[PDB]
Amino acid sequence: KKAQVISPVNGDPFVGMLETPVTSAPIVATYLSNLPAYRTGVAPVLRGVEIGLAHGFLLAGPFIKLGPLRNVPETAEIAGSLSAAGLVLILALCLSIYGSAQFQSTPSIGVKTLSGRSVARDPLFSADGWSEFAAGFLVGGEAGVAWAYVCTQILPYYS
Amino acid sequence: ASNKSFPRDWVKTDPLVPVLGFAGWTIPANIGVSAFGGQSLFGLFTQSIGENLAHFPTGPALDDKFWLYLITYHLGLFLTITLGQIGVQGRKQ
Amino acid sequence: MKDFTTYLSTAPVIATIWFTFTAGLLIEINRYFPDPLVFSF
Amino acid sequence: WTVPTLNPDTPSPIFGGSTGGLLRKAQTEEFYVITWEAKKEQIFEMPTGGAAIMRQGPNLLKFGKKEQCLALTTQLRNKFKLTPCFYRVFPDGKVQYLHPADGVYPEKVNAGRVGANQNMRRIGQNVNPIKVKFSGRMMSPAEI
Amino acid sequence: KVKIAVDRNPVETSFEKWAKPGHFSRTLSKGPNTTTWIWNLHADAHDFDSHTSDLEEISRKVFSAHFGQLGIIFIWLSGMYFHGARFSNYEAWLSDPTHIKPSAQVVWPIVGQEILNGDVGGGFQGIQITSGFFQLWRASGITSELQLYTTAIGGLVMAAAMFFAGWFHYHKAAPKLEWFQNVESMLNHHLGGLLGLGSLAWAGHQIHVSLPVNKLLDAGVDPKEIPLPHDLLLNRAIMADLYPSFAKGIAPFFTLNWSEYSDFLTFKGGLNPVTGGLWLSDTAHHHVAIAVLFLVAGHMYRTNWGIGHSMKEILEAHRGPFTGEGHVGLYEILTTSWHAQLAINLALFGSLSIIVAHHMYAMPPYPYLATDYGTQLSLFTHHTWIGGFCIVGAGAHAAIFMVRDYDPTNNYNNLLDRVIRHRDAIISHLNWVCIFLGFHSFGLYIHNDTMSALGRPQDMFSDTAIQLQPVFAQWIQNTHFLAPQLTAPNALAATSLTWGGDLVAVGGKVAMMPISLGTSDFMVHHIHAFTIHVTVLILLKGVLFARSSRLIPDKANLGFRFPCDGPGRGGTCQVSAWDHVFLGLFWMYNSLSIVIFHFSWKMQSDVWGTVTASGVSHITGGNFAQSANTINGWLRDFLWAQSSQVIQSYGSALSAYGLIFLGAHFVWAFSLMFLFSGRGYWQELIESIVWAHNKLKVAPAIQPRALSITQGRAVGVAHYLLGGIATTWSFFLARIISVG
Amino acid sequence: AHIVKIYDTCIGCTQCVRACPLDVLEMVPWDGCKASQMASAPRTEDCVGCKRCETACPTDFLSVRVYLGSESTRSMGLSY
Amino acid sequence: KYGENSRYFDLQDMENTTGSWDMYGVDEKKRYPDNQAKFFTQATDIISRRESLRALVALSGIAAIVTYGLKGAKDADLPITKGPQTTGENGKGGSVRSRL
Ligand code: CLA
Ligand code: CLA
Ligand code: CLA
Ligand code: CLA
Ligand code: CLA
Ligand code: CLA
Ligand code: CLA
């Protein structure tokens, strides 16, 4: 009764998205603004190392706990960390060839923000920016997995 | 139509919805029946919460007569708050 | 009664009647003459 | 009848916002824009799902592919008896007119049309595919 | 103002239209010219919306057709009671339920089928039944074949009554429309009258016949010496001998002193230890409470007096912030369309059937039911399958309502509208969860298979290696086993023995023992969840994309049933909602096959078996917890090990199953021609054979045409389901009739 | 783009035009039949090849054909 | 004008009427303390191109797998010179005829 929560995107009912308290709630919006993949003003190398540090450190775990070397003591950590570094390596290769295939042609035309003003295009979406991002990912991921081993070896009540 | 922009207040916070929620549900949740021998559905697993808070890192047993208290307690606590929030009769009833 | 006879003249009814006739005929022959394999007679 | 252009300040019908609107075929390649003038307010059916309310007067929509504009055109034409027209819009400010593109919808014959893709032989007077073999590309014998 | 509104003599009674096939529609009427017209005559016979366009006539049609269905059901029941009366060994079964197996069918001594007459015990020969009418009849109190014969005659009479009723209400007194559109009166009368008064009447019959007769039968006296039930009605003092509350008559009831009826209206929990069924006093008390509940519920709606609810008011009051106008406009949908009603009713009806199956194995209600293994397996399986088919039907008719009877002008901003308006989010997330469950639920089995074949059984998911415990179900199991001491203070036992506790053994065999849940149970349960979600995906996608989609913007104008929209835009085979129903049928087959396999093997491994007074020796030795994590485990221990009886049944009195096995396979493999191929090839081949007839002047003057695309698909799925289900039927019955 | 060709057995009954869901067919004046009309396909770059034009043609073996060819982003009917 | 009383489709303003918005994309500087720009951009200077890190992954992948062959002898469970320490199925070959 003269109360509604769910709205179409910025007016405009003819773009295939509609706004919900899942997508456009304020705390969710500010949260996903503050993630490194949406910042647009920083150099892509640094985003690469942040994202890599995060993903390597999380990728180390399951190989440690559930890998085929998980019951033999004191070497269950080594094989897991090494395998995780291998996975990060392959992810870096995937990023490189994606850069070779995606941005290989002309970019798009135009972009505006939601509360309309003409914002410029993100420099991550050019060939150079993406390649730099991939290098940052490799560095960050390997550093993260190495830190996972380090963190295992010196940590109060790890088990 | 439905709207043109998402309102950044959709949960209209009335401050005495939650306090009446759990305060007006727990003050009658600890009465005392013949059913438990003189105990409540808020003090009988206060014993439990503190009881397996004593031995801390051991997660409590997977048949221990108090998961029932947790589940049947929240099954009513959430319900009374979700019917309290529809005590926004500001335009409807 | 003419239309009832014409209804009895439709395809599935005559299929049912005629296959009942043929089936029953073979069944009776197999009762009174049990287990035929060769003709020799 | 000359070829008309559109006036992009006409209002749009009331609608809630579907999933099935414009995706990024519109951002890079093209999207189609339909226009008609109604006489009385009425509820019609979108060719994506849901129901919308057309306004008293000129209206305006936008769609992804062409079969959507043709579906809405057939529905608005055989059921409500109106005269819609839909355009093609490229994503830089280029507007192309189509349907009818002759003034008259293409069933009533309008003198002054040039017939294309119009062979002048019986269907079984085509050559064998051995006599069109070894050409620049794959060819059907009835394409020559 | 709800009242009677009937028209007089609308359609006269003559055989005139029986000699004019296809009289009902305008298209069919002109007579055949191809063989497509025969299949069109049979395809549109019950499509009552495709004769006319008026509600009243359709409603009268469906009313009289309902009468026809009821009549045929009565003929069926009458047949069952008659065959029980004349061609069975029911009395010899009552004399000794163990060691005498139920048989109710006798074959004629012809070409050699007389070997099918098995030695069922009791000086009788015939085919063992698993339908379990004998336990039902003993639960009702039937002791003689004469009463069965009388019931048979009564059933036949009621059948004739039903057919006459149908004739009367279509031809002589046919109701108007607004008779039908009084749904509130129908709700009151069904809820009160049918359900409630049926419960109350059956409670009466139990209290006055089934309690005492079964008390005497379980007391040990043979059935002939037991007094006839009219002596139990007429003589109060015999009931006073059995249950002393009856000596006080009906005085306790009317003065609210109900505590004195504690002799025949009880609340004890588990089972009858001498019988294996439920306590009949509980059953009577149950129907009494049911009847009071339903008779109370039936006075809810407004018919002619001011009291009661209106459906429109209730619906229109429920609307929130997240859903716009809420339910405004569902009453007009649900009183003017029959397919919507058929959808809802088939849905809840089929789900109800499956719940029937589950409760019916868990808490066996009939006397001497739990130790007849074949009956248990057959009843659970049968109700499972019927539930599945009905739910798929719900999907189909919801789709038909989406195509035909949906009008968006009366339905603007609404729950139905908003569901249509975010179908993309709905189907995308349902797709995601299907894939997630797929990978995990089936990859666990592939991983266990690989690890168990590579020499390392320590890296597979099992009870001894990496463990996956269903902690939730175990906790709920213990909760309900503990319920009679805290949360059900007045029961003497749990509601079933599967929640835990002791063992009930009747005649050496096991009635029910507690069931444990381990890792194999975890994995199979997630398999069930996976297949259910996939079927939901297909059917719900069919419903939502029935009117239009991004691919076809005008799919509504092509109708409900259509084959394609050409090879264009890539190719658009199978875009109708009908084909979504088709693929749904396949997946329903898959999911339910897994369910009944799970039940069969779990029961044979952890519940049934003999109490040899040396512990319990189950039928298959209890190998479910170790083998149900490898596909090789299922294929070997279940399919290959348990088929030894169905393949070696030749020469015994069980060979019909080992002979219908192969035929079921044959039909299954025969379906594939219809599924794989296409009709153009068959059209050309049929044309060449038509030439071979044109040579000899045997050209049929009706024209041979190949089947249409939709019919070819439908016939394919028909043969597929028939063959698969017949195979499973043969296998189950041979196995459990042989060793059970 | 596909290949749509109109042949001379056409009687000009406008069924193909009313069946086309993309407006690639139109009726042009002609002096070869009783109706003095004939179909034509001036816009075969919008055709998707659904073959409703073939289904709507009354004259036996058809007076209109749709030959399938190299697909594009418009002839696949892709809306995304 | 686009953002008005249901006046959609502004022809010259295409980036609204099309659906090309940045949903969650903010743009400002100083996300990081300054000298990580130094420590990480002077660290990824070598592999900052298409061929460079793509050569690096080749170098490391080879120098890892080839050495895994002959120094991944940390039991590999079975094969690597731990071998069959029992004469496993030499004479056991057939069931009816032995055949070795
Ligand atoms: C012929 C192809 C092939 C080969 C040779 C292997 C070989 C192997 N597989 Mg494998 N696999 C294959 C195909 C193959 N796979 C396919 C097709 C699949 C999909 C079905 C899988 C799925 C699969 C799974 C799921 C797993 C394996 C695992 C393994 C390892 C088992 C050895 C062991 O006991 O763990 C000993 C393992 C180690 C000692 C770790 C070595 C890690 C790499 C080889 C070293 C990397 C060096 C380092 C990162 C370089 C530094 C870079 C620098 C920038 C810092 C071994 C390396 C296991 C594994 O490694 O995961 C833990 C495992 O769990 N495989
Ligand atoms: C609906 C369930 C049902 C089923 C599945 C059966 C099945 C069977 N009954 Mg049975 N029966 C039923 C109900 C049923 N009955 C009822 C309700 C009664 C009480 C009236 C009986 C009384 C009964 C007796 C007394 C006997 C059987 C017997 C049999 C068996 C052999 C039947 C036979 O040889 O037919 C013979 C074949 C025919 C009669 C062919 C008739 C086909 C005609 C020509 C079709 C014409 C088409 C026409 C338009 C439609 C029919 C209309 C109708 C009004 C005639 C068979 C297992 C026999 C048995 O068990 O022996 C051991 C037996 O003696 N039944
Ligand atoms: C107490 C009254 C009463 C009772 C018992 C029923 C019972 C039934 N109605 Mg019903 N109905 C009622 C009032 C009642 N209705 C009213 C007031 C209306 C008008 C609003 C309708 C309108 C209605 C429609 C439109 C339909 C039904 C249908 C049905 C049947 C559902 C099938 C089923 O599961 O039955 C289980 C089977 C049985 C219980 C067998 C017992 C059958 C006997 C004959 C008891 C019937 C009592 C009878 C209605 C009382 C009047 C008898 C007559 C001689 C005056 C069921 C027999 C459906 C049906 O099947 O149509 C035939 C159907 O389509 N009813
Ligand atoms: C709905 C089913 C049902 C039915 C049919 C009955 C029927 C009966 N119960 Mg009963 N009962 C039921 C449910 C039922 N009960 C339930 C649910 C309970 C549990 C609370 C009980 C508990 C119970 C007890 C404890 C006792 C009975 C008893 C009786 C019998 C006598 C009732 C009595 O004292 O007079 C009640 C009076 C009437 C019902 C009036 C009947 C009016 C007649 C039928 C009208 C005929 C008029 C007509 C014009 C005649 C035509 C004349 C001409 C044509 C010839 C009677 C057979 C008593 C009995 O006999 O025990 C064996 C008894 O002691 N019942
Ligand atoms: C209460 C149950 C119920 C009712 C009343 C209806 C009623 C209807 N359905 Mg429906 N349906 C149901 C359940 C039901 N269905 C279920 C459970 C399913 C899922 C399988 C379907 C799936 C379904 C589809 C897919 C379609 C319908 C359609 C229809 C309509 C036309 C039916 C027709 O002409 O059949 C004519 C009768 C037949 C075709 C009989 C043939 C049935 C099979 C081949 C026989 C079964 C074999 C048998 C078990 C074993 C063979 C024995 C021996 C010969 C070997 C009609 C309104 C059609 C429609 O368009 O609606 C408008 C349609 O397209 N229904
Ligand atoms: C056994 C045969 C088989 C299999 C495996 C599938 C598999 C699938 N069908 Mg399916 N289908 C089949 C027969 C089969 N179908 C038949 C006969 C029909 C006709 C009725 C259908 C009709 C049908 C419909 C109508 C639908 C599906 C859907 C699905 C998907 C469900 C999601 C899922 O579980 O994916 C997970 C994948 C698997 C479980 C396959 C096994 C994967 C293994 C275990 C791990 C893979 C990792 C691999 C080893 C790594 C590769 C290494 C290599 C490169 C070296 C899935 C792709 C539904 C769908 O797509 O929506 C979700 C859907 O709508 N199918
Ligand atoms: C079980 C599997 C199976 C069977 C039985 C057949 C059978 C046949 N196929 Mg084949 N086919 C199959 C699978 C199968 N196919 C598959 C999977 C494919 C891939 C798509 C094909 C593709 C295929 C093609 C492309 C062609 C065939 C052809 C044929 C026919 C060959 C002639 C012949 O042997 O006559 C023997 C015929 C039979 C054994 C049919 C059974 C008839 C039964 C026994 C009579 C009915 C019994 C009883 C009355 C039924 C009562 C039930 C009642 C309710 C009606 C025959 C009908 C060819 C054909 O038609 O050439 C003439 C042909 O062109 N098939």
Residue numbers in the entry:
A (entry chain L): 38 to 196
B (entry chain O): 31 to 123
C (entry chain J): 1 to 41
D (entry chain D): 53 to 196
E (entry chain A): 12 to 751
F (entry chain C): 2 to 81
G (entry chain H): 31 to 130
Authors' description from the paper:
Photosystem I and II (PSI and PSII) are two multisubunit pigment-protein complexes embedded in the thylakoid membranes of higher plants, algae, and cyanobacteria, and carry out light capture and subsequent photochemical reactions in oxygenic photosynthesis. PSI and PSII each consist of core complexes and its peripheral antenna systems.
The overall structure of this Cr-PSI-LHCI-LHCII is composed of two moieties: the PSI-LHCI supercomplex and two LHCII trimers. One LHCII trimer (LHCII-1) attaches to the PSI core by PsaO, PsaH, and PsaL subunits, whereas the other LHCII trimer (LHCII-2) attaches to the Lhca2 and LHCII-1 subunits. LHCII-2 has no direct interactions with the PSI core subunits, but associates with the PSI core through Lhca2 and the LHCII-1 trimer.
